[PDB]
Amino acid sequence: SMNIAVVTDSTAYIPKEMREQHQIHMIPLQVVFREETYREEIELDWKSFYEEVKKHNELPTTSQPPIGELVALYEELGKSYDAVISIHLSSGISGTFSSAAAADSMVDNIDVYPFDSEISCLAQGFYALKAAELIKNGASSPEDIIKELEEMKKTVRAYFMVDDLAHLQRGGRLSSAQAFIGSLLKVKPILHFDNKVIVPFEKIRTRKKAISRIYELLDEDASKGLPMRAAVIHANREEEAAKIIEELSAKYPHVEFYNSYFGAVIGTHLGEGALGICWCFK
Ligand SMILES: CCCCCCCCCCCCCCCC(=O)O
Ligand SMILES: [Br-]
Ligand SMILES: [Br-]
Ligand SMILES: [Br-]
Ligand SMILES: [Br-]
Ligand SMILES: [Br-]
Ligand SMILES: [Br-]
Ligand SMILES: [Br-]
């Protein structure tokens, strides 16, 4: 029956060729520099970001997409589609989600179904892949697709570490956590999402130990022998990510592994040297 489009914001970091394969449209968030503000992924790739930042001593900030651009995308989309699955980074770390919702009453020709992925990066990307796959196999209810995504959210996991805690501190997305701890985070932990916001998952002494702990955490799901997607995400640490994927994929042939990155908007908050691993059931 009805035609359903799929949208995600840039911070899902789905490779552009893969988005084309799967019919996934994308709305960029912004990275703000001293002179220029860019639309990430389209106007600034991840290597340029980390290169620009260190060779200009940039202290970038980020912005959600202008509500105007969301509306324009939906209006355009609505000429060929009845509904859009609009998938976004956590409502606890960005106003993007709530702008997608508010943009729905601003467009007549399409029904927007905002989905709070309560996460970001390729973990959020995974929801858009599932949505496209469902749509490809004749999913004709936007509601049924959303139900599907919410169930999948039950088993999506992500753990990550940063090199310098200062970037997160600066961007403000450790506020909730620190509001609950009652004080200031000084030592680097494993981080994860809990109730839509970033919080320490566990105290750890070294990055090496953090990775090994995350391996254990992955094994808990990877050991069931059920089909999975997983991504090792880096902020300018591609070789390190590749060694991890080399070792992990050998160990888990049933887990499809992606080498992915923190782009300009997310890397603005995590900082170069950040590393994480996420996964979910296919
Ligand atoms: C493999 C692990 C992936 C986990 C994803 C971590 C996301 C980093 C959180 C901080 C970024 C906040 C973005 C704010 C954008 C805006 O200004 O609205
Ligand atoms: Br792009
Ligand atoms: Br329409
Ligand atoms: Br509408
Ligand atoms: Br479905
Ligand atoms: Br630090
Ligand atoms: Br926060
Ligand atoms: Br660490």
Curated annotation (Swiss-Prot):
Signal peptide: none annotated. Hexadecanoate binds at T62, S94. InterPro entries: DegV (IPR003797), DegV_C (IPR043168), DegV_domain_contain (IPR050270). Transmembrane segments: none annotated. Residues 4-281 form the DegV domain. Gene3D superfamilies: 3.30.1180.10, 3.40.50.10170. Keywords: Lipid-binding. GO terms for molecular function: lipid binding. Disruption phenotype: No growth phenotype, no effect on competence. Binds long-chain fatty acids, such as palmitate, and may play a role in lipid transport or fatty acid metabolism. Monomer. This is Protein DegV. It comes from Bacillus subtilis (strain 168).
